[PDB]
Amino acid sequence: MNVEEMKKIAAKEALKFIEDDMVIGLGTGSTTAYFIKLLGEKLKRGEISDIVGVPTSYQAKLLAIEHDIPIASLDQVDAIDVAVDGADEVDPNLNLIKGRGAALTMEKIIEYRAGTFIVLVDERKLVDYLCQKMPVPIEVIPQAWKAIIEELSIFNAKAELRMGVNKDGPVITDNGNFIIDAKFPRIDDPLDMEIELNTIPGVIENGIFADIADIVIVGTREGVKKLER
Amino acid sequence: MNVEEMKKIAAKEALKFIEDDMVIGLGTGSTTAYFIKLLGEKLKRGEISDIVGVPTSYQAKLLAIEHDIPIASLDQVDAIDVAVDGADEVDPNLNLIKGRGAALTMEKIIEYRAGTFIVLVDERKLVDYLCQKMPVPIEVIPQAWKAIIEELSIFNAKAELRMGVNKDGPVITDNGNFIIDAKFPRIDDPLDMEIELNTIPGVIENGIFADIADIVIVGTREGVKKLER
Amino acid sequence: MNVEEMKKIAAKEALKFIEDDMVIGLGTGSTTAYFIKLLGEKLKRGEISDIVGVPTSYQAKLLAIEHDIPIASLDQVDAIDVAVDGADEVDPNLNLIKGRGAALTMEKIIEYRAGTFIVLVDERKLVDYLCQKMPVPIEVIPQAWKAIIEELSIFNAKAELRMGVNKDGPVITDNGNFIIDAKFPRIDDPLDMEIELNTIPGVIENGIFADIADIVIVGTREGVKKLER
Amino acid sequence: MNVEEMKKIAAKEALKFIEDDMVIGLGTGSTTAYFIKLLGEKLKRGEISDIVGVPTSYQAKLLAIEHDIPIASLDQVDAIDVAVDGADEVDPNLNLIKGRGAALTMEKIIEYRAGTFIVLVDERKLVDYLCQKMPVPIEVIPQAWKAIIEELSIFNAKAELRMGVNKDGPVITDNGNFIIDAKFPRIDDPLDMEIELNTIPGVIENGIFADIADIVIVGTREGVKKLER
Ligand SMILES: O=C(O)[C@H](O)[C@@H](O)COP(=O)(O)O
Ligand SMILES: O=C(O)[C@H](O)[C@@H](O)COP(=O)(O)O
Ligand SMILES: O=C(O)[C@H](O)[C@@H](O)COP(=O)(O)O
Ligand SMILES: O=C(O)[C@H](O)[C@@H](O)COP(=O)(O)O
Ligand SMILES: [Cl-]
Ligand SMILES: [Cl-]
Ligand SMILES: [Cl-]
Ligand SMILES: [Cl-]
Ligand SMILES: [Cl-]
Ligand SMILES: [Cl-]
Ligand SMILES: [Cl-]
Ligand SMILES: [Cl-]
Ligand SMILES: [Cl-]
Ligand code: NA
Ligand code: NA
C-alpha cells in the first residue's frame, strides 16, 4: 500500500495513546516525523491541550518547533508519560535495534524514563531475530573506535565506522561522537548483549533496545497491527 | 584525462614540494586523499623520511593512520613547514572557498600557520570569482543557526542548514557544531568579508580562505599547472 | 552597604524594564542570579506574565528552572526583547569585559540580538579603561591554544590557560573549549581589539563586549545609578 | 616522609616496569605527573628509548609534550603495554575509585586495554572498603543529570552535581559532559555496581575501577610496597 502509507497509519494509531497534560518523548526519523506533524495539527485544532514534547534529537526538536509544539529538555520535566519513536528492527519479543538516525543516546535516555514506550514502524522492520536485516549502531568515544571494532570480532560482528556524505570523514553524532555499525550474524540474548556492549570502555550507548518497548504499532499493507508485552 | 586522473596528477606534483624532516599539514577531501596515500607510499619505500603530519580532520587523521604516517596535533609541533589541502573554488588572486567537507575550523587553524600553503585542485575549481559556483560554508554554534540564517539573508545570501544523510537532523562538525551553506552573489573583497563574517556572534569559522594560499597546483585535462602568489 | 547588597539593588532596578510578553536573555553569574530569582518571585505573585527566558549558560538555565521561569534556546524564539547579564568590567563608554564565568560564547550570541542589553554590576566593576582590573577571557579550540598564546605576544599581553580546580587539566567550557585569560596593558579601541582577536583562526570568542551594552545599572554605596549611551 | 615523596617513590618504582619500545598509558593527577616527568628525564638521558605515550587527559598530554615524550591517541597504536595512573581509593582486592580529576572516561578506555595497569598511590588512598572516604564520580550526558541523581538517591547514594570554581555552572569534562559525585555508605560489590551504573542510559562512565588494576605501587612511610593479587 506504499511504505509511506504504512508509516502514517502507524502514526495515526499512536495518537490514541496521547492525552491532555502529558509530557511526550518525541522520537527521531521518518515514521515518527508523521506522528509529530499529526500531533501539532491536533494541538492547533484544540483537540488536545497542555502537551509538552521532549525531543530525542535536533531533527525532532526542529520539527516540533515548526509545528508549534512546546518543548522542554529532560531536566525540565518531572516525568515522561509516553515516548514515541521508530526502530530499524523489531523482534518477536519486541527487542529493537535503533540508531540508523544516530540519535540513540538521547533516545534511550528519554525512552528509558517513559511510563509507556510506543514504537512505530512499517512491515519491513519486523524480523525473526535481531540482526536478521540490520547492524547495531554503537556510539563510541572517537579514539576508541578501532579497538572496539577489533574487540567485536569475538562476536563475529562485521563492524564498520560510519562515514559522512554531507561531511568528509566519520559521521559525528549530536554529542561529538563516532558511530560504529556492527553487523552481528545473530544476537541470541539481546538484553545481555545490550549490557555487554555498554560495559566496554569507550562505548557510549548501543542500538539494542531490549526490555524497554511497551507497545509496538505496526503499519501493515492491510491496516494496522500491534504487538504487546 | 578525467577528473580523478586530474586530481591524481595534482597530488603527485605536490610531492615534489615535500622534503625529509618536514611537519606537513594534511588536508581534507578527495584530492588531498591521493596526496596522503602517495606520501604514505613514499615513506614506506624510504623515498622520504622523518615526516610528521598534522591532520586537519578526522578524515585526514584516519587516512594517515591507515597509511602509517606519524601524526601530531598542532600543539605538539614547533611549526608547520607545508600544509597541503584542497578547495571548492579558487579565484584569479588565489583566494579560496573551502568547507564542503565541513572541516574548515581545523583546516584554517593549521593552514594559517604553515610556511607554505599548497592547494590541490582539478580544472573545475577555477572560477572567475569567488561564489561563481559554490556557496560559502559557515560553521555555527548550534543554537545560533536560525538567527544567523536570517541575518545572512538580509545580506543577500541564500543560506541553508546542511543536513545529514548518514544521520538524521543537521550535519554535525568534528567540533560538535552545525554548518550553513550560504550562496553569496560574487565576492569582490574576500579578505574583508572573511574577517567581518567571523565577527558575528555564533559564527565560528567561514569557508573563505583569503590571503593565505601560496601555491595552487592544478590538474588539467592534459597535464599540470602551477599558480603562485 | 556591602557587595551583595549592591548587587541586589541593581537586580531590583532591572526588573523595572521587564514587561509582560517579553523574551528575556538570562545572563550568567551572581549579580544576575539575583535578577533571575526576583523575576521568578514576581512571576509567582502574578505581577508579570507571559515571559520566556533564554539562558546564556547551564547556570542560568538551572536557576530559571528552579524558579519556574519558562525557558527556550535562541532558535525557539522570534527575538530577544531584553537581555540581562553582568560584567567583569565596565568602562566609561560602556564597553565591557565579560567571561569570568566562561559563558562568553552563549552570552554574546544572545546579547548581540537583544533589543535592549542591560548590564548589572556593583561599583567594583567600573573601570577607567578596559583591563584596569581584569583580564580578557578568550575561548579557543583546544589544539590551537599554545599557538594562540604565543601569537598574543605581539600585544604585550600576559596570557595564561585557565586551569580547573574541580577537574584536573584546563577549564572546559560548556562547548568543549579552553579559555585563555589575557591581561593586555590597556585597550585603546575595545571594538578593534574585539575584532582582531576573533580574526585569529582558533579563537572562537573573546570577552570584550564593545558597542553592545545599552544600559548599565550600577549598585553603589549611595544607592542605584543608571548609565546609558 | 612527606606526602609528595610517597608519590615520588611510587613513581620512581613504576619506571622499573618500563622498557624500550613500549606504548604507555599516561594517567592523570599529581602522583602520575611525577612519573611522566621521570619518564621524560629517563628518555632525555637515553636510559630508555622509542617509547610512545597515550595520554588519558589534556593534563597528561600537555605534561608529556613539555617533556618531549612522543604521544598518540589510542587509535594510533596497536597496543598499550603498560598504563600508569593514580587513584582516589584502593580496596584490599585492588579495586579502585578514580575520577576526582574528571578524566575517568579516557582513563578507563586506555587502562582497560593495557597489558599491565599499574596504579600509583601514597598510604592514604588505601581503604577497608570502597567509598570509605570518597564518592564515586559518574560522568553523565548533561540533560540526564537530574534524573540520574534522583535514580541514584533511590539507593542511598548522596549525589551532587559537581560545580565549577574557575567557571560558573557545572564542571565540564573533556568530552563536554557533567560529573555527578555519588557517596554510597559502602560498595561491598565494586564490579557489580560498576556495571550497573554504566547500564543506566545517560551514564557514560563511572569511577569504580574494579578488577582491572594489575599492580598497585604504594608509597609507604616505610619506603614502598608492590601489591598484586
Ligand atoms: O532509531 C532511529 O534512529 C530511528 O527511529 C529509526 O529507528 C527509524 O527511523 P525511520 O522511522 O525513518 O525508519
Ligand atoms: O575544504 C574542504 O573541505 C576540501 O578541501 C574541499 O575544498 C575539496 O574537496 P575535494 O578535493 O574532494 O573536491
Ligand atoms: O561574564 C560573566 O561571566 C559574568 O556575567 C560575570 O562577568 C559577572 O559575574 P558576577 O555578577 O558574579 O560578578
Ligand atoms: O582519577 C584521577 O582522576 C586521578 O588519578 C586522581 O584521582 C588521583 O590523583 P592524585 O594522584 O593527584 O591524588
Ligand atoms: Cl536514531
Ligand atoms: Cl572529519
Ligand atoms: Cl572541509
Ligand atoms: Cl552525512
Ligand atoms: Cl539530530
Ligand atoms: Cl561568563
Ligand atoms: Cl573548576
Ligand atoms: Cl584534562
Ligand atoms: Cl554553565
Ligand atoms: Na561530547
Ligand atoms: Na564543541
Give the Cα separation of B98 and B100 in Å (integer).
6
Give the Cα separation of C153 and C148 in Å (integer).
9
Those residues whose C-beta lies under 8 Å from the C-beta of residue A164, and which sit 6 or more positions away, are: A170, A171, A172, B102, B164, B165, B166, B171
End-to-end Cα, chain B, rounded Å: 27
Those residues whose C-beta lies under 8 Å from the C-beta of residue D45, and which sit 6 or more positions away, are: none
Cα C11 to the center of its chain, rounded Å: 14
Domain count for chain D, please give it: 2
Which is nearest to C124 in space by CA: C226, C221, C9? C221
D50: CATH: 3.40.50.1360
Distance of CA C100 from the midpoint of ligand 3 (Å): 6
What's at D95, amino acid-wise? N
User: What ligand 3 atom has the least distance to the C-alpha of C121?
Assistant: 11
Which chain D residues are within 8 Å of A105, Cβ to Cβ?
141, 201-202
Secondary structure letter of residue A163 according to DSSP: B
State which H helix or E strand residue D37 sits in. Answer: helix D30-44
State which H helix or E strand residue D9 sits in. Answer: helix D3-14
Q: Do D109 and A202 touch (CB under 8 A)?
A: yes
Distance of CA A128 from the midpoint of ligand 5 (Å): 21
Burial of C22 (0-12, 13-18, 19+ CB in 10 A): middle
Other beta carbons less than 10 A from residue A127's beta carbon: 18
Pocket test for ligand 2, best of B26, B58, B100 (most atoms within 8 A of CB): B100
Alpha helices in chain A (DSSP H): 3-14, 30-45, 58-66, 104-112, 145-151, 190-198
Which is nearest to A226 in space by CA: A211, A212, A214, A208? A214
End-to-end Cα, chain A, rounded Å: 27
Q: Do A101 and B168 touch (CB under 8 A)?
A: yes
Give the Cα separation of D176 and D174 in Å (integer).
6
User: What ligand 4 atom has the least distance to the C-alpha of D120?
Assistant: 11
Those residues whose C-beta lies under 8 Å from the C-beta of residue D31, and which sit 6 or more positions away, are: D7, D10, D11, D86, D120, D121, D122
Do C53 and C104 lie in one domain? The reply is: yes
Query: Sheet of C178-183: strands edge to edge?
Result: C158-161, C178-183, C136-140, C203-206
Q: What distance in Å separates residue B67's CA from the closest CA in chain D?
A: 11
Half-sphere exposure of residue C90: CA atoms within 13 angstroms, side-chain side: 25
Interface of B with D in 13-72 (CB under 8 A): 62, 65, 71
Residue nearest to atom 11 of ligand 1 (CA): A31
Q: Which three cell numbers stand for residue C151?
A: 601569537
Cβ contact A88:A82 at 8 Å: no
Beta strands B178-183 and B136-140 are antiparallel
State which H helix or E strand residue D65 sits in. Answer: helix D58-66
Burial of B223 (0-12, 13-18, 19+ CB in 10 A): exposed
Give the Cα separation of A28 and A103 in Å (integer).
7
Give the Cα separation of D35 and C4 in Å (integer).
45
Which chain B residues are within 8 Å of C199, Cβ to Cβ?
195, 198
Those residues whose C-beta lies under 8 Å from the C-beta of residue A100, and which sit 6 or more positions away, are: A29, A88, A134, A137, B168
What technique was this entry resolved by? X-ray
End-to-end Cα, chain C, rounded Å: 27
φ, ψ for residue C101, nearest 5 deg:
-70, -5
CA separation, residue B13 to residues B9, B44, B229 (Å): 6, 19, 17
Query: Sheet of B224-228: strands edge to edge?
Result: B52-55, B23-26, B80-85, B114-122, B215-219, B224-228
Cβ contact C25:C56 at 8 Å: yes
Please give the annotated binding residues of A for substrate, written as ranges: 28-31, 85-88, 98-101, 125
Half-sphere exposure of residue B87: CA atoms within 13 angstroms, side-chain side: 36
Q: Which residue has the cell 502574578?
A: C46
* Maximum Cα–Cα distance across chain C: 55
Q: Give the number of whichever ligand sits closest to the CA of residue A10.
A: 1
C98 is in an annotated binding site: yes
Helix axes D190-199, A190-198, angle to 10 degrees: 100
Distance of CA D18 from the midpoint of ligand 6 (Å): 35
- Bridge partners (DSSP) of residue D70 are none
Those residues whose C-beta lies under 8 Å from the C-beta of residue D150, and which sit 6 or more positions away, are: none
Q: Give the number of whichever ligand sits closest to the CA of residue C102.
A: 10
Q: What distance in Å separates residue A141's CA from the closest CA in chain D?
A: 9
Do B150 and B226 lie in one domain? The reply is: no
Q: Which residue has the cell 555487554?
A: A196
Q: Which of C65, C75, C176 sits opposite A76 (nearest CB)?
A: C65
Q: Which residue has the cell 585535462?
A: B221
The secondary structure of chain B as a DSSP string is: --HHHHHHHHHHHHGGG--TT-EEEE--SHHHHHHHHHHHHHHHHTSS-S-EEEESSHHHHHHHHHTT--B--GGG-S-EEEEEE--SEE-TTS-EE--TTS-HHHHHHHHTTEEEEEEEEEGGGB-SSTTSS--EEEEE-GGGHHHHHHHHHHTT-EEEE-B-SSSSSB---TTS-EEEEEE-S--S-HHHHHHHHTTSTTEEEESEE-S---EEEEE-SSSEEEEE-
Do B59 and B135 lie in one domain? The reply is: no
Give the Cα separation of B60 and B120 in Å (integer).
15
User: What ligand 3 atom has the least distance to the C-alpha of C86?
Assistant: 5
Query: Sheet of D23-26: strands edge to edge?
Result: D52-55, D23-26, D80-85, D114-122, D215-219, D224-227
Which chain B residues are within 8 Å of D65, Cβ to Cβ?
75-76
A76 Cβ under 8 Å from any chain C Cβ = yes
Secondary structure letter of residue D49 according to DSSP: -
D75 Cβ under 8 Å from any chain B Cβ = yes
Which chain A residues are within 8 Å of B29, Cβ to Cβ?
168
Is there an atom of ligand 1 within 6 Å of A217 CB?
no
Q: Which residue has the cell 595534482?
A: B10
Neighbours, chain B (3 or more CB pairs < 8 A): A, C, D
Give the Cα separation of A198 and A195 in Å (integer).
5
The secondary structure of C15-59 as a DSSP string is: GGG--TT-EEEE--SHHHHHHHHHHHHHHHHTSS-S-EEEESSHH
Give the Cα separation of C9 and C224 in Å (integer).
7
Do A115 and A13 lie in one domain? The reply is: yes
φ, ψ for residue B7, nearest 5 deg:
-65, -40
State which H helix or E strand residue D227 sits in. Answer: strand D224-227
Which is nearest to D29 in space by CA: D112, D121, D97, D95? D121
CA dihedral D58, D60, D66, D68 (to 10 degrees): -120
Burial of D156 (0-12, 13-18, 19+ CB in 10 A): exposed
Those residues whose C-beta lies under 8 Å from the C-beta of residue B111, and which sit 6 or more positions away, are: B25, B27, B56, B83, B85, B117, B209, B212
φ, ψ for residue C221, nearest 5 deg:
-65, -30
Do A174 and A67 lie in one domain? The reply is: no
Which is nearest to D166 in space by CA: C159, C61, C173, C89? C173
φ, ψ for residue A4, nearest 5 deg:
-60, -30
Burial of D95 (0-12, 13-18, 19+ CB in 10 A): buried
Q: Do C167 and D173 touch (CB under 8 A)?
A: yes
Beta strands C89-90 and C96-97 are antiparallel
Do A113 and A213 lie in one domain? The reply is: yes
Cβ contact D204:D105 at 8 Å: yes
Q: Give the number of whichever ligand sits closest to the CA of residue D169.
A: 13
Do D87 and D136 lie in one domain? The reply is: no
Do B27 and B140 lie in one domain? The reply is: no
At A54, is the secondary structure helix, strand, or coil?
A: strand
Do A34 and A112 lie in one domain? The reply is: yes
Pairs across C and D, CB distance < 8 A:
85
Pairs across B and C, CB distance < 8 A:
69
Those residues whose C-beta lies under 8 Å from the C-beta of residue D196, and which sit 6 or more positions away, are: none
Cβ contact A60:A32 at 8 Å: yes
Which is nearest to C37 in space by CA: C11, C59, C58? C11
Cβ contact D148:D180 at 8 Å: yes
End-to-end Cα, chain D, rounded Å: 27
Which is nearest to A212 in space by CA: A150, A119, A81, A123? A119
Long-range (24+ apart) CB contacts under 8 A made by C12-16 are: C12/C38, C12/C224, C13/C217, C13/C224, C13/C226, C14/C84, C14/C118, C14/C120, C14/C217, C15/C39, C15/C42
Give the Cα separation of B66 and C75 in Å (integer).
40
Q: Which three cell numbers stand for residue C195?
A: 575584532
Phi-psi region of B121 (alpha: psi -120 to 50; beta: other; left: phi over 0): beta
Give the Cα separation of D100 and C128 in Å (integer).
41
Other beta carbons less than 10 A from residue A227's beta carbon: 16
Q: What angle do CA B164, B168, B171 make, to 5 degrees?
A: 30
C73-88 core/surface letters (b: 16 or more CB in 10 A; e: else) = bbbbbeebbbbbbbbb
Q: Give the number of whichever ligand sits closest to the CA of residue C63.
A: 13
Q: Which of B65, B75, B176 sits opposite D75 (nearest CB)?
A: B65
Query: Which domain covers residue B186, as residue numbers?
Result: 129-207
Do C166 and C107 lie in one domain? The reply is: no
Cβ contact B39:B18 at 8 Å: yes
Query: Sheet of C89-90: strands edge to edge?
Result: C89-90, C96-97, C208-209
Torsion D108-A175-C104-C10 (CA) sign: negative
Is there an atom of ligand 4 within 6 Å of D56 CB?
no
Do D20 and D106 lie in one domain? The reply is: yes
Q: Do C141 and B195 touch (CB under 8 A)?
A: no
Beta strands B80-85 and B114-122 are parallel
What's at D87, amino acid-wise? A
C143: CATH: 3.30.70.260
The secondary structure of B74-139 as a DSSP string is: GGG-S-EEEEEE--SEE-TTS-EE--TTS-HHHHHHHHTTEEEEEEEEEGGGB-SSTTSS--EEEE
A186 Cβ under 8 Å from any chain D Cβ = no
Active site residue B222: no
User: What ligand 3 atom has the least distance to the C-alpha of C88?
Assistant: 7
The secondary structure of chain C as a DSSP string is: --HHHHHHHHHHHHGGG--TT-EEEE--SHHHHHHHHHHHHHHHHTSS-S-EEEESSHHHHHHHHHTT--B--GGG-S-EEEEEE--SEE-TT--EE--TTS-HHHHHHHHHTEEEEEEEEEGGGB-SSTTSS--EEEEE-GGGHHHHHHHGGGGT-EEEE-B-SSSSSB---TTS-EEEEEE-S--S-HHHHHHHHHTSTTEEEESEE-S---EEEEEETTEEEEEE-
C136 Cβ under 8 Å from any chain B Cβ = no
Query: Sheet of D136-140: strands edge to edge?
Result: D158-161, D178-183, D136-140, D203-206
Which chain B residues are within 8 Å of D75, Cβ to Cβ?
62, 65
Distance of CA B117 from the midpoint of ligand 6 (Å): 20
Give the Cα separation of C167 and C169 in Å (integer).
7
Which is nearest to D166 in space by CA: C99, C32, C139? C99
D100 is in an annotated binding site: yes
Pocket test for ligand 3, best of C88, C90, C97 (most atoms within 8 A of CB): C88
Interface of C with B in 140-159 (CB under 8 A): 141-147
CA separation, residue D213 to residues A42, B142, C207, D119, D216 (Å): 57, 41, 44, 7, 7
Give the Cα separation of D75 and D113 in Å (integer).
12
What's at C104, amino acid-wise? L
Which is nearest to A142 in space by CA: A184, A173, A97? A173
Q: Which of C71, C76, C176 sits opposite A65 (nearest CB)?
A: C76
φ, ψ for residue C144, nearest 5 deg:
-95, 0
State which H helix or E strand residue D198 sits in. Answer: helix D190-199
Cβ contact C77:C21 at 8 Å: no
Cβ contact D70:D52 at 8 Å: yes
Do B99 and B158 lie in one domain? The reply is: no
What's at A38, amino acid-wise? L
C169 Cβ under 8 Å from any chain D Cβ = yes
Q: Which residue has the cell 569582490?
A: B188
Give the Cα separation of C217 and C225 in Å (integer).
6
Residue of chain C whose Cα is closest to the Cα of D58? C169
Residue nearest to atom 7 of ligand 1 (CA): A87
Q: What angle do CA B48, B49, B53 make, to 5 degrees?
A: 100
Q: What distance in Å separates residue D75's CA from the closest CA in chain B?
A: 8
